[PDB]
Design a protein around this ligand. Structure first.
Ligand SMILES: [Mg+2]
Ligand SMILES: [Mg+2]
Ligand SMILES: [Mn+2]
Ligand SMILES: [Mn+2]
Lengths: 176, 180
């Protein structure tokens, strides 16, 4: 598996092995962020496994990953939903297409990404991959936003940035 | 290190090795919890290190631990603040002396404790011990209480139980005043 390196503009210039790519000096690459709701309109929040190289054990939005060469974002979302959560989803829809960020985790591991954000509904039960997810919670989008707004440090920095973007919060809010 | 064992009552029965004590069954033993506030009245929230046997990588109140043989709970509090946080504190105040809690952690480690809770002010800068604490934040208590209300699952369960005890919460509130 790989990440796609991106030049100044977001042109793909090459690839790196996924694990080797995330260091204290992580270079800009392509990724996605996804927010999953069930038929009832509850938001899935997940906790990353303690073995994740970047932000292990951190509570975050439903699913995140790295599109591979030639893979659409939508497909990468579908792929990681199946891989991390064994869950089928409706066609992902765009909720924050220009999201980009750089952050440093507590051990100094950096994420540095162009990271369009999506939402979708699950259409099957979860089946948890414990190599990726150590815990999760179905909740009210309203309570999660209240938590993000009160103690954003309790959550991943990108979850926070996405949830506090005016328009993205609007589009997520209509998912209930 | 070890832990002090208590019977079905809160009466000491003996001691047990620390690590060895905390497993998927763990016997009742003595512990402490403390909530630390800086001069400004901000609350120190900390994140347990990934290597912690129990609740690794979990956000929680400032410090918790186990008094050792011959030690007073307050001395225990003082020692762990120094060990984990490198920080000096004012005499710890008892804010929830009867708090008890049994709980299973995400990987099945059980904590079964008599755990009096304290509050104190820090009197020195922090020197975080990365073997024990992987992240920390100075925050407004009000904010922390809002997050705990909104997403309680995002924090250690003992942090939440203590925070929602009315009497404990009022003592936490008293420590938000600015002091010089
Ligand atoms: Mg992922
Ligand atoms: Mg401790
Ligand atoms: Mn990445
Ligand atoms: Mn214990």
């Amino acid at each position: 598996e790989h990440v796609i390196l991106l030049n100044a503009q977001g042109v793909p210039t090459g690839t790196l092995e996924k694990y080797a790519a995330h260091t204290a000096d992580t270079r800009l690459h392509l990724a996605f962020s996804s927010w999953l709701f069930n038929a009832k309109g509850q938001l899935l929040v997940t906790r990353r496994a303690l073995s994740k190289k970047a932000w292990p054990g951190v509570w975050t939005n439903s699913v995140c990953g790295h599109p591979q060469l030639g893979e659409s974002n939508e497909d990468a979302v579908i792929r990681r939903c199946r891989y991390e959560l064994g869950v089928e989803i409706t066609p992902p829809e765009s909720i924050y297409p220009d999201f980009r960020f750089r952050a440093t985790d507590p051990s100094g591991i950096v994420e540095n990404e162009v990271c369009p954000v999506f939402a979708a509904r699950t259409t099957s039960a979860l089946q948890i991959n414990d190599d990726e997810v150590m815990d999760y919670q179905w909740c009210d989008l309203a309570d999660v936003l209240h938590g993000i707004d009160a103690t954003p440090w309790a959550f991943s920095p990108w979850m926070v940035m996405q949830a506090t973007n005016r328009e993205a919060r609007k589009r997520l809010s209509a998912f209930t």
